[PDB]
Ligand SMILES: COc1ccc2c(c1)CN(C(=O)CCN1CCC(Cc3ccccc3)CC1)CCS2
């Protein structure tokens with residue numbers, strides 16, 4: 066097992082040259098979207114940034130506002146994501162959720178549960194460095210009750226690190242996840258919260274196994290996906306995430322594409338945020354648990370230029 | 384994988400209660416092995432340094448000098464490896480294979496072939512500081528031929544990023560490895576040094592795949608494990624470590640205990656060094672590739688107090 070994405074460094078890259086294709090593309094005419102497109106998706110994020118630099122030094126123009134005036138719709142909204150520094154992208158998306166795209170647990174839940182401790186720590190740091198306010202306080206401020214609580218637990222980045230596991234605390238803990246299952250996770254939130262937030266990854270993987278031999282069931286079985294409140298969804302995100310991050314995101318991506326209308330906000334966040342970290346893994350995983358390819362899914366459930374960009378990001382292999 | 388070791392931090396660590404315990408353990412009273420033994424292998428390494436230091440504030444004795452003057456043979460060499468700082472254990476054993484050892488090409492192969500880039504980067508500089516000379520320049524003076532050359536390449540820590548895996552590039556590598564295979568690795572030479580030492584890992588595992596069906600058989604079968612001088616052992620070891628590190632090391636453990644005698648020195652090096660990184664993982668790949676339990680072979684083949692300490696290091700299970 067080796068984590069990896071779909072966007073690699075362009076060899077032969079020249080800041081100053083790409084700055085010209087782009088300027089020239091959006092020069093006076095309407096717009097060569099097809100050029101903006103193929104280029105920005107066949108560069109990496111650090112290379113995008115240096116084009117952003119070449120643009121200014123050459124032209125006196127801000128690449129980011131130029132793009133943002135000739136592009137619209139789901140197209141714009143993707144391009145704008147690709148130009149965003151990847152150190153920064155998640156802290157950004159959190160703010161949007163904490164401040165103005167709506168009522169926003171799908172994001173808080175999904176970023177917080179799926180980002181490892183190295184990441185939550187960095188996101189927190191940078192959330193405050195960029196945005197002036199601190200991640201934790203914005204979260205407290207716009208959330209509630211036991212959900213708020215566990216986001217706060219996850220957000221500390223303070224899991225017991227990995228060594229030889231206590232089949233004795235495994236037996237207690239699996240036991241207590243059983244009782245809180247039977248009871249619709251509506252009693253002793255107090256208790257399960259730490260089990261899922263402060264325990265380790267392969268404590269919890271052990272635990273989820275001993276869970277099966279208490280109850281005959283996977284822990285996932287306790288928690289339905291349409292209806293549920295906030296908390297249940299956080300639990301089940303934690304759960305799937307402990308088992309496998311690529312796999313959780315592959316899932317999040319299928320359910321972003323099922324249903325009337327559909328979910329471009331998600332498509333975009335996952336695609337872009339993972340483009341240089343694990344996207345290949347998510348893709349091969351998607352072929353694995355859902356048996357049409359990520360590529361194929363997208364080509365059916367997207368249109369026009371946005372569609373094209375997507376697939377280019379996606380690549381093609383598995 | 385989640386890579387875990389078998390040694391953890393003792394909760395409620397008392398730096399000097401433990402220092403006392405080592406005093407009356409080895410004082411008067413020439414020695415008392417089983418509290419020495421059990422203490423050191425329930426405390427993590429960095430805690431053993433704290434016990435080493437509170438020993439000096441408290442008593443005016445250098446803990447380590449004391450630990451080794453009351454103890455003999457293999458057990459002694461174990462305690463002396465346990466109280467040797469993580470950062471430093473590797474570079475010390477490189478050195479003691481290089482400085483003065485005889486002709487120890489076995490230890491070089493092992494450490495450089497199993498260590499990741501970031502572990503080699505820390506070795507090189509902590510090596511460089513601790514013994515005034517650079518790890519490379521030493522490696523160079525006592526070795527020669529392509530064995531030297533290949534080591535210098537691995538010694539670089541700069542091997543391609545796991546990325547877009549280029550189908551065309553694979554096949555040319557695999558045929559080049561087919562080419563040099565039939566010629567028993569005795570010639571062509573200089574291109575496989577670049578295939579092994581620089582290709583990206585998710586790349587080199589696909590070449591390992593693509594090769595077999597060119598050749599009939601795995602790359603490994605081209606090389607005769609025991610009837611094979613330095614280079615071919617290195618090469619072999621690199622191939623192995625590319626598929627899985629815990630599995631190289633599991634093979635090296637098995638070959639240290641299987642047969643006539645015991646390679647005790649080797650057994651100490653692996654058990655100790657990897658005890659806080661992947662020892663559980665070496666234990667698990669051990670049982671799956673050899674059908675016995677590491678624990679129960681260290682038993683079958685080692686003796687006395689050395690044994691109980693090893694089995695404590697080895698950890699409780701599976
Ligand atoms: C304390 O340990 C922790 C604490 C929390 C978490 C993990 C490890 C990771 N995890 C795992 O399943 C194990 C390891 N896994 C996580 C993703 C990471 C890959 C990755 C790289 C860069 C950016 C994002 C993801 C490494 C492999 C799930 C819960 S989040």
Ligand SMILES: COc1ccc2c(c1)CN(C(=O)CCN1CCC(Cc3ccccc3)CC1)CCS2
Nearest residue numbers: 386496497498499500542543584624625626627628
């Ligand atoms: C260019 O890369 C390299 C170059 C050389 C080598 C490795 C990685 C390690 N390796 C692999 O197959 C990569 C898998 N690997 C396991 C070790 C390490 C585990 C790990 C994870 C997180 C933090 C510390 C250690 C990194 C992932 C075997 C050959 S030596």
